[PDB]
Amino acid sequence: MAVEVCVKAAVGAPDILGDCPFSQRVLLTLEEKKITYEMKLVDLSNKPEWFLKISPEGKVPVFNSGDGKWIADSDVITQVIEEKFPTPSLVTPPEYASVGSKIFPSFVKFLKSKDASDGSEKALLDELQALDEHLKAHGPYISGENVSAADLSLGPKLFHLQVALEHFKGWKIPENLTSVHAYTKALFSRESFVKTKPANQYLIAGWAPKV
Amino acid sequence: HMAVEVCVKAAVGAPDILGDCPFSQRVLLTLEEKKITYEMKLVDLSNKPEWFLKISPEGKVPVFNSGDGKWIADSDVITQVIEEKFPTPSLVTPPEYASVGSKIFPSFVKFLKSKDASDGSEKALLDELQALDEHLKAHGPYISGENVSAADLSLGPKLFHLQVALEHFKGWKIPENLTSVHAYTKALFSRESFVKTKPANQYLIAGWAPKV
């Protein structure tokens, strides 16, 4: 009956909240909807039996809306939360549902880039330039003055971009992208972001093996 | 296969805040006016990183990359290369007026550093400001008429330094009777590109303070 979420813990630290942008988008949704929930943590390098009972395929995040039935995939979970707890509404107009869609994959490529001439920096910057033009013309958030589902999905992605790219590449989202900087500052300073984000330490620790 | 980038001076102790370099500002104004997609990379010169040390080994700013991997120094060179690679919109200033106000920045620094009022540094600055007023009254509102050009983007940031520092350290102003210089200054400093790249007064004052 009680809402439960299972999210990624740090490797070797089953009691420390991990760097999953998908899990964090789910956490941001429950925080913004003001739902009371139990947050379970899982170290996938040492999966406990309770985790394998609720997630037989080892998927994270998993969500239990209070019916004992666990469901996977962040797109699915957030939309089931929107359907079951519709107020406060977090619906993003379909018109803007794909703003910033190429930013996360662009980031990972440039983070992994060992070649300073494969066009990966330029590609990420062009995606960030588009985001800036959108935010410039359409409120502080993706859908105007109010936060919506697109923000809760993009936010963790841009947060990973900010922390991992600074640590690994010494690269920052350029300050001339004033609209993305206004967005970043507002999104991250919301009580929901402050209560659900990983520490920079464990965001960097979570990407280090992949770099 | 590279992004358009520029390394510029950051505020001291604030690597995510733009600083007081008028030459970096000129390049920044050029990139903004041309509407080019670019990334400004901030460099605190009091804490120079190794990524900056590589691109610009002599530790100088601004340095520019148009997307070819070739780091170019000197704002005179940079703004002209930007004009060649991206001619539209045009910022070409007619050669007739390309050197209008070229003596003002060194006369400002000379007068600011001056302790002796009999130096001639003050009078020399005045004559140049007076000369600028006449040119701007005849060929204004900008150095080349109704629209901004390269000369305005070079002179603009220099005039802002003169205005802030001379007021701060001496209580000195560009005489109000220079109505065209004042109209030009009001117009330049209010443009989007200028509002955006205009340094906070303290950065500029704290920079000149040791030199004064």
Short mmCIF file of C-alpha atoms in Angstrom, two decimals:
data_model
loop_
_atom_site.label_atom_id
_atom_site.label_comp_id
_atom_site.label_asym_id
_atom_site.label_seq_id
_atom_site.Cartn_x
_atom_site.Cartn_y
_atom_site.Cartn_z
CA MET A 1 0.00 0.00 0.00
CA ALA A 2 2.98 2.34 0.74
CA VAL A 3 4.71 3.75 -2.30
CA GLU A 4 8.24 2.38 -2.80
CA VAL A 5 11.09 3.09 -5.20
CA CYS A 6 14.30 1.20 -5.67
CA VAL A 7 17.21 3.30 -7.04
CA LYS A 8 20.96 2.74 -7.71
CA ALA A 9 23.39 2.92 -4.76
CA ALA A 10 27.15 3.66 -5.10
CA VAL A 11 29.43 0.70 -6.01
CA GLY A 12 30.61 -0.88 -2.75
CA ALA A 13 28.39 1.50 -0.69
CA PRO A 14 24.90 0.00 -0.36
CA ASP A 15 23.91 2.89 1.91
CA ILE A 16 25.03 5.73 -0.38
CA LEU A 17 22.69 7.13 -3.09
CA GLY A 18 24.10 6.58 -6.60
CA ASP A 19 24.32 8.48 -9.92
CA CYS A 20 21.29 7.22 -11.93
CA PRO A 21 19.73 10.06 -13.99
CA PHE A 22 16.70 7.80 -14.70
CA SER A 23 16.18 6.87 -11.02
CA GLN A 24 16.69 10.63 -10.15
CA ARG A 25 14.07 11.71 -12.68
CA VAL A 26 11.67 9.24 -10.93
CA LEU A 27 12.68 10.67 -7.50
CA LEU A 28 12.19 14.27 -8.78
CA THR A 29 8.64 13.33 -9.94
CA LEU A 30 7.63 11.92 -6.53
CA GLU A 31 9.20 14.97 -4.79
CA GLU A 32 7.40 17.46 -7.08
CA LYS A 33 4.05 15.51 -6.72
CA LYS A 34 4.64 15.53 -2.89
CA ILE A 35 4.17 11.77 -2.56
CA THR A 36 5.29 10.02 0.64
CA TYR A 37 7.54 7.09 -0.35
CA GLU A 38 10.10 4.52 0.83
CA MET A 39 13.39 4.77 -1.02
CA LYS A 40 15.28 1.51 -1.31
CA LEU A 41 18.92 1.53 -2.56
CA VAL A 42 20.76 -1.24 -4.44
CA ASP A 43 24.44 -1.93 -5.05
CA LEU A 44 24.32 -3.81 -8.38
CA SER A 45 27.90 -5.12 -7.93
CA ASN A 46 26.48 -7.13 -4.91
CA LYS A 47 22.72 -7.52 -5.50
CA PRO A 48 20.89 -8.60 -2.32
CA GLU A 49 18.03 -11.15 -2.33
CA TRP A 50 15.34 -8.54 -1.55
CA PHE A 51 16.33 -6.71 -4.79
CA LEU A 52 16.23 -9.89 -6.91
CA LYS A 53 12.72 -10.67 -5.52
CA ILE A 54 11.31 -7.31 -6.77
CA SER A 55 13.49 -6.91 -9.87
CA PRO A 56 14.20 -10.39 -11.25
CA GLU A 57 16.04 -8.92 -14.28
CA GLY A 58 18.27 -6.60 -12.18
CA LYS A 59 16.70 -3.43 -13.54
CA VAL A 60 16.87 -0.08 -11.75
CA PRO A 61 14.88 2.04 -11.23
CA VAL A 62 11.86 -0.05 -10.24
CA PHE A 63 8.65 1.38 -8.78
CA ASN A 64 5.79 0.13 -6.64
CA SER A 65 2.79 2.52 -6.68
CA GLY A 66 1.27 0.85 -3.59
CA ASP A 67 -0.14 -2.32 -5.25
CA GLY A 68 2.93 -4.59 -4.68
CA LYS A 69 3.53 -4.71 -8.48
CA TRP A 70 7.01 -3.48 -9.48
CA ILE A 71 7.49 -1.73 -12.81
CA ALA A 72 10.72 -0.71 -14.60
CA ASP A 73 11.69 2.08 -17.14
CA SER A 74 11.74 5.78 -16.06
CA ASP A 75 9.51 6.88 -19.00
CA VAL A 76 6.93 4.30 -17.93
CA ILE A 77 7.17 5.00 -14.15
CA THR A 78 6.88 8.83 -14.47
CA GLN A 79 3.88 8.52 -16.80
CA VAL A 80 2.18 5.99 -14.43
CA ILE A 81 2.83 8.51 -11.59
CA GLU A 82 1.25 11.30 -13.74
CA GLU A 83 -1.75 9.01 -14.34
CA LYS A 84 -2.20 7.87 -10.73
CA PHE A 85 -1.39 11.16 -8.95
CA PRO A 86 -2.41 13.80 -11.55
CA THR A 87 -2.16 16.85 -9.27
CA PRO A 88 0.01 18.85 -9.15
CA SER A 89 0.22 18.37 -12.90
CA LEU A 90 3.66 17.96 -14.42
CA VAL A 91 2.46 17.44 -18.03
CA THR A 92 4.81 18.82 -20.71
CA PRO A 93 2.99 19.90 -23.95
CA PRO A 94 3.93 17.37 -26.73
CA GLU A 95 5.08 20.40 -28.73
CA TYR A 96 8.17 20.65 -26.37
CA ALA A 97 8.51 16.98 -25.29
CA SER A 98 11.72 16.52 -27.35
CA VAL A 99 13.64 19.70 -26.37
CA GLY A 100 17.16 18.68 -25.30
CA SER A 101 16.64 15.09 -26.57
CA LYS A 102 20.12 14.84 -28.09
CA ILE A 103 22.06 16.52 -25.20
CA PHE A 104 22.64 13.34 -23.02
CA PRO A 105 23.94 11.06 -25.83
CA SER A 106 26.07 13.97 -27.14
CA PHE A 107 27.61 14.40 -23.64
CA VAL A 108 28.55 10.71 -23.23
CA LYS A 109 30.29 10.68 -26.63
CA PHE A 110 32.38 13.76 -25.81
CA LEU A 111 33.13 12.42 -22.26
CA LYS A 112 34.37 9.15 -23.84
CA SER A 113 36.13 10.98 -26.69
CA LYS A 114 39.84 10.36 -26.75
CA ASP A 115 40.14 12.31 -30.12
CA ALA A 116 40.10 16.11 -30.00
CA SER A 117 38.92 16.24 -33.66
CA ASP A 118 36.00 13.76 -33.91
CA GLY A 119 33.46 16.66 -33.86
CA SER A 120 31.96 15.54 -30.53
CA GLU A 121 32.52 18.87 -28.67
CA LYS A 122 30.95 20.81 -31.56
CA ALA A 123 27.98 18.42 -31.61
CA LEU A 124 27.24 18.78 -27.86
CA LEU A 125 27.65 22.60 -28.10
CA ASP A 126 25.18 22.76 -31.06
CA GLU A 127 22.63 20.81 -28.99
CA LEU A 128 23.21 23.17 -26.03
CA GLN A 129 22.82 26.21 -28.39
CA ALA A 130 19.42 24.89 -29.52
CA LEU A 131 18.36 24.40 -25.85
CA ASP A 132 19.38 28.01 -25.12
CA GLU A 133 17.27 29.36 -28.06
CA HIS A 134 14.25 27.36 -26.84
CA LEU A 135 14.61 28.52 -23.19
CA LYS A 136 15.22 32.11 -24.37
CA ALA A 137 11.86 32.21 -26.17
CA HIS A 138 9.82 29.93 -23.92
CA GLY A 139 9.86 30.73 -20.20
CA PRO A 140 12.64 29.77 -17.79
CA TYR A 141 11.74 26.06 -17.97
CA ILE A 142 11.13 23.88 -21.10
CA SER A 143 7.42 24.69 -20.77
CA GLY A 144 7.39 28.29 -19.48
CA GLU A 145 7.34 29.60 -15.87
CA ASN A 146 6.42 26.19 -14.37
CA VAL A 147 8.45 22.99 -14.00
CA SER A 148 7.18 19.93 -15.95
CA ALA A 149 8.16 16.29 -16.81
CA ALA A 150 10.73 17.35 -19.45
CA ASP A 151 12.62 19.32 -16.80
CA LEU A 152 12.64 16.39 -14.39
CA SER A 153 14.07 14.16 -17.21
CA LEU A 154 16.60 16.71 -18.63
CA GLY A 155 17.77 18.09 -15.25
CA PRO A 156 19.65 14.94 -14.12
CA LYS A 157 21.17 14.66 -17.62
CA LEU A 158 22.48 18.27 -17.57
CA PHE A 159 23.67 17.70 -13.95
CA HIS A 160 25.71 14.65 -15.09
CA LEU A 161 27.02 16.77 -18.03
CA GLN A 162 28.08 19.57 -15.65
CA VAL A 163 29.85 17.41 -13.01
CA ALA A 164 31.39 14.67 -15.25
CA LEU A 165 32.59 17.00 -18.05
CA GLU A 166 34.21 19.39 -15.55
CA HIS A 167 36.02 16.59 -13.73
CA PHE A 168 37.04 14.48 -16.73
CA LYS A 169 37.42 17.09 -19.54
CA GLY A 170 37.76 20.42 -17.73
CA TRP A 171 34.81 21.48 -19.91
CA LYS A 172 31.97 23.70 -18.73
CA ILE A 173 28.63 24.78 -20.25
CA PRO A 174 29.80 28.14 -21.63
CA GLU A 175 28.43 31.20 -19.79
CA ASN A 176 27.35 32.82 -23.08
CA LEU A 177 24.50 30.20 -22.98
CA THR A 178 22.69 32.49 -20.51
CA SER A 179 19.29 30.70 -20.86
CA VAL A 180 20.76 27.24 -20.06
CA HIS A 181 22.62 28.80 -17.08
CA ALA A 182 19.44 30.44 -15.74
CA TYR A 183 17.64 27.03 -16.18
CA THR A 184 20.44 25.03 -14.56
CA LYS A 185 20.62 27.36 -11.53
CA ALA A 186 16.82 27.33 -10.97
CA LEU A 187 16.33 23.58 -11.58
CA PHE A 188 19.20 22.47 -9.30
CA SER A 189 18.27 24.84 -6.48
CA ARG A 190 14.72 23.38 -6.16
CA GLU A 191 14.18 21.40 -2.92
CA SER A 192 13.38 18.33 -5.07
CA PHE A 193 16.84 18.48 -6.77
CA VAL A 194 18.70 19.17 -3.52
CA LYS A 195 17.02 16.09 -1.87
CA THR A 196 17.51 13.63 -4.80
CA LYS A 197 20.89 14.41 -6.44
CA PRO A 198 23.98 12.25 -5.91
CA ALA A 199 27.14 13.80 -4.40
CA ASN A 200 29.71 14.93 -7.05
CA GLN A 201 31.99 12.25 -5.57
CA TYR A 202 29.67 9.36 -6.45
CA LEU A 203 28.55 10.87 -9.79
CA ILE A 204 32.30 10.95 -10.76
CA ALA A 205 32.91 7.52 -9.20
CA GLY A 206 29.97 6.12 -11.23
CA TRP A 207 31.38 7.37 -14.57
CA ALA A 208 35.14 6.83 -13.92
CA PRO A 209 35.12 3.06 -14.95
CA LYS A 210 33.30 4.00 -18.22
CA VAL A 211 35.92 6.65 -19.17
CA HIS B 1 35.46 19.45 -37.08
CA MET B 2 35.84 21.73 -34.04
CA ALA B 3 33.62 24.31 -32.30
CA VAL B 4 34.06 28.10 -32.56
CA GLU B 5 35.76 28.88 -29.20
CA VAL B 6 37.42 31.88 -27.50
CA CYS B 7 39.47 31.94 -24.29
CA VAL B 8 38.78 35.16 -22.30
CA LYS B 9 39.78 36.59 -18.89
CA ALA B 10 37.52 35.56 -15.97
CA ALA B 11 36.93 37.59 -12.74
CA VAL B 12 39.63 37.06 -10.06
CA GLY B 13 38.50 34.25 -7.75
CA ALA B 14 35.41 33.63 -9.98
CA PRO B 15 36.16 31.33 -12.94
CA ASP B 16 32.48 31.23 -13.98
CA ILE B 17 32.17 35.04 -14.17
CA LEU B 18 33.56 37.13 -17.10
CA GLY B 19 36.27 39.71 -16.17
CA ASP B 20 37.49 43.19 -17.28
CA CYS B 21 39.58 42.54 -20.47
CA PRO B 22 38.50 45.11 -23.14
CA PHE B 23 40.19 43.15 -25.93
CA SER B 24 38.44 39.86 -24.96
CA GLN B 25 35.17 41.91 -24.76
CA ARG B 26 35.80 43.17 -28.30
CA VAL B 27 35.98 39.56 -29.59
CA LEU B 28 32.93 38.62 -27.48
CA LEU B 29 30.97 41.60 -28.99
CA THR B 30 32.06 40.48 -32.51
CA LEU B 31 30.89 36.89 -31.87
CA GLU B 32 27.57 38.15 -30.45
CA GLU B 33 26.92 40.68 -33.24
CA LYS B 34 27.62 38.06 -35.96
CA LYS B 35 25.19 35.62 -34.17
CA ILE B 36 27.79 32.81 -34.43
CA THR B 37 27.33 29.68 -32.34
CA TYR B 38 30.33 29.74 -30.03
CA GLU B 39 31.65 28.76 -26.63
CA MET B 40 33.40 31.30 -24.37
CA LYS B 41 36.01 29.51 -22.21
CA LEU B 42 36.74 31.47 -19.04
CA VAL B 43 40.30 31.70 -17.71
CA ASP B 44 41.22 33.11 -14.25
CA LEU B 45 44.67 34.52 -15.07
CA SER B 46 45.63 34.50 -11.34
CA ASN B 47 45.08 30.65 -11.38
CA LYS B 48 46.02 29.59 -15.02
CA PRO B 49 44.95 25.97 -15.75
CA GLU B 50 46.90 23.42 -17.87
CA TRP B 51 44.25 23.30 -20.63
CA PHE B 52 44.76 27.07 -21.03
CA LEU B 53 48.59 26.76 -20.66
CA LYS B 54 48.54 24.31 -23.66
CA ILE B 55 46.32 26.38 -26.10
CA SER B 56 48.10 29.65 -25.13
CA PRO B 57 51.57 28.94 -23.68
CA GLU B 58 52.44 32.64 -23.23
CA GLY B 59 49.36 32.89 -20.88
CA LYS B 60 47.71 35.63 -22.95
CA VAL B 61 44.00 36.40 -23.61
CA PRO B 62 42.00 36.55 -25.81
CA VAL B 63 42.88 33.49 -28.02
CA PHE B 64 40.47 32.20 -30.73
CA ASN B 65 39.66 29.00 -32.60
CA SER B 66 37.24 29.24 -35.56
CA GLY B 67 36.79 25.43 -35.72
CA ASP B 68 40.07 24.45 -37.42
CA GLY B 69 42.24 23.86 -34.34
CA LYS B 70 44.38 26.98 -35.01
CA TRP B 71 44.64 29.20 -31.89
CA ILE B 72 45.06 32.86 -32.93
CA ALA B 73 46.07 35.68 -30.58
CA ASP B 74 45.53 39.56 -30.68
CA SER B 75 42.01 40.98 -30.82
CA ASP B 76 42.94 43.01 -33.96
CA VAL B 77 43.84 39.79 -35.74
CA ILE B 78 40.92 37.78 -34.20
CA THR B 79 38.12 40.26 -35.16
CA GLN B 80 39.51 40.43 -38.77
CA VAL B 81 39.70 36.62 -39.15
CA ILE B 82 36.06 36.48 -37.81
CA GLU B 83 35.12 39.06 -40.50
CA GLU B 84 36.74 36.93 -43.24
CA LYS B 85 35.29 33.52 -42.20
CA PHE B 86 31.84 35.03 -41.37
CA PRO B 87 31.23 38.12 -43.53
CA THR B 88 27.49 38.30 -42.85
CA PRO B 89 26.32 40.38 -41.06
CA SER B 90 29.06 42.85 -42.05
CA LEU B 91 30.96 44.80 -39.36
CA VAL B 92 33.48 46.28 -41.86
CA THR B 93 34.35 49.83 -40.90
CA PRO B 94 35.42 52.09 -43.80
CA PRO B 95 39.24 52.54 -43.76
CA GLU B 96 38.48 56.29 -43.69
CA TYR B 97 37.22 55.85 -40.07
CA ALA B 98 38.96 52.61 -39.00
CA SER B 99 41.41 54.53 -36.77
CA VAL B 100 38.89 56.96 -35.13
CA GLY B 101 39.63 57.08 -31.38
CA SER B 102 42.77 54.92 -31.64
CA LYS B 103 44.72 57.18 -29.22
CA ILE B 104 42.09 57.34 -26.44
CA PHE B 105 42.84 54.03 -24.60
CA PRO B 106 46.64 54.75 -24.12
CA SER B 107 45.89 58.40 -23.17
CA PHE B 108 43.39 57.15 -20.55
CA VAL B 109 45.96 54.74 -18.99
CA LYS B 110 48.69 57.46 -19.15
CA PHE B 111 46.43 60.05 -17.45
CA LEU B 112 45.08 57.52 -14.89
CA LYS B 113 48.64 56.49 -13.88
CA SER B 114 49.69 60.19 -13.79
CA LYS B 115 50.34 61.91 -10.46
CA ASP B 116 51.68 65.17 -12.08
CA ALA B 117 48.87 67.45 -13.43
CA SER B 118 51.38 69.32 -15.69
CA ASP B 119 52.23 66.11 -17.75
CA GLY B 120 49.95 67.00 -20.64
CA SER B 121 48.29 63.54 -20.27
CA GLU B 122 44.97 65.18 -19.32
CA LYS B 123 44.98 67.70 -22.19
CA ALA B 124 45.95 64.98 -24.69
CA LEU B 125 43.01 62.84 -23.52
CA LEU B 126 40.69 65.85 -23.79
CA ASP B 127 41.75 66.71 -27.38
CA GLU B 128 41.11 63.16 -28.49
CA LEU B 129 37.70 63.05 -26.77
CA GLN B 130 36.95 66.44 -28.42
CA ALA B 131 38.12 65.05 -31.81
CA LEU B 132 35.83 62.02 -31.34
CA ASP B 133 32.89 64.31 -30.62
CA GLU B 134 33.42 66.18 -33.88
CA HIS B 135 33.69 62.98 -35.94
CA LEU B 136 30.63 61.49 -34.20
CA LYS B 137 28.66 64.76 -34.70
CA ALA B 138 29.46 64.67 -38.49
CA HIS B 139 29.38 60.91 -39.14
CA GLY B 140 27.42 59.47 -36.18
CA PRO B 141 25.70 58.06 -34.13
CA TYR B 142 28.38 55.37 -34.43
CA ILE B 143 31.95 55.60 -35.91
CA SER B 144 30.37 54.69 -39.27
CA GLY B 145 26.82 56.07 -39.17
CA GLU B 146 23.50 54.51 -38.12
CA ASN B 147 24.84 50.90 -37.64
CA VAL B 148 27.63 49.34 -35.52
CA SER B 149 30.87 48.28 -37.15
CA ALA B 150 34.24 46.86 -35.95
CA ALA B 151 35.63 50.18 -34.72
CA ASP B 152 32.66 50.60 -32.29
CA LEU B 153 33.30 47.12 -30.83
CA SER B 154 36.95 47.94 -30.26
CA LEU B 155 36.41 51.50 -28.89
CA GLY B 156 33.27 50.70 -26.83
CA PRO B 157 34.94 48.53 -24.18
CA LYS B 158 37.88 50.95 -23.93
CA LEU B 159 35.57 53.93 -23.34
CA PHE B 160 33.77 51.92 -20.61
CA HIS B 161 37.12 51.46 -18.78
CA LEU B 162 37.87 55.21 -19.13
CA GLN B 163 34.41 56.10 -17.78
CA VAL B 164 34.52 53.76 -14.73
CA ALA B 165 38.24 54.08 -13.70
CA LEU B 166 38.61 57.86 -14.28
CA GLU B 167 35.46 58.44 -12.19
CA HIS B 168 36.50 56.01 -9.47
CA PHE B 169 40.11 57.12 -8.99
CA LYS B 170 39.87 60.82 -9.95
CA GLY B 171 36.22 61.93 -10.04
CA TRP B 172 36.88 62.59 -13.74
CA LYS B 173 34.29 62.58 -16.48
CA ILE B 174 34.05 62.67 -20.31
CA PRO B 175 32.81 66.28 -20.46
CA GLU B 176 28.99 66.58 -20.77
CA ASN B 177 29.49 69.12 -23.59
CA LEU B 178 30.70 66.19 -25.75
CA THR B 179 27.03 65.44 -26.55
CA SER B 180 27.83 63.08 -29.45
CA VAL B 181 30.40 61.09 -27.42
CA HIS B 182 27.71 60.79 -24.72
CA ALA B 183 24.99 59.76 -27.18
CA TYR B 184 27.43 57.16 -28.64
CA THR B 185 28.39 55.87 -25.18
CA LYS B 186 24.71 55.66 -24.11
CA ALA B 187 23.79 53.83 -27.31
CA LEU B 188 26.77 51.39 -27.33
CA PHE B 189 26.55 50.45 -23.61
CA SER B 190 22.79 49.74 -23.87
CA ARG B 191 22.98 47.26 -26.84
CA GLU B 192 22.25 43.59 -25.95
CA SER B 193 25.82 42.49 -26.75
CA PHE B 194 27.28 45.21 -24.55
CA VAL B 195 24.84 44.64 -21.58
CA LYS B 196 25.76 40.93 -21.82
CA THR B 197 29.64 41.28 -21.94
CA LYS B 198 30.01 44.48 -19.84
CA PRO B 199 32.23 43.69 -16.82
CA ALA B 200 31.09 44.48 -13.26
CA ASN B 201 32.66 47.85 -12.27
CA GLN B 202 34.60 46.33 -9.35
CA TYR B 203 36.52 43.96 -11.70
CA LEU B 204 37.74 46.89 -13.80
CA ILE B 205 38.46 49.15 -10.69
CA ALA B 206 40.28 46.32 -8.76
CA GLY B 207 42.35 45.66 -11.92
CA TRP B 208 43.59 49.25 -12.37
CA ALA B 209 44.03 49.87 -8.61
CA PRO B 210 47.52 48.22 -8.34
CA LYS B 211 48.60 49.98 -11.58
CA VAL B 212 47.42 53.43 -10.36
#
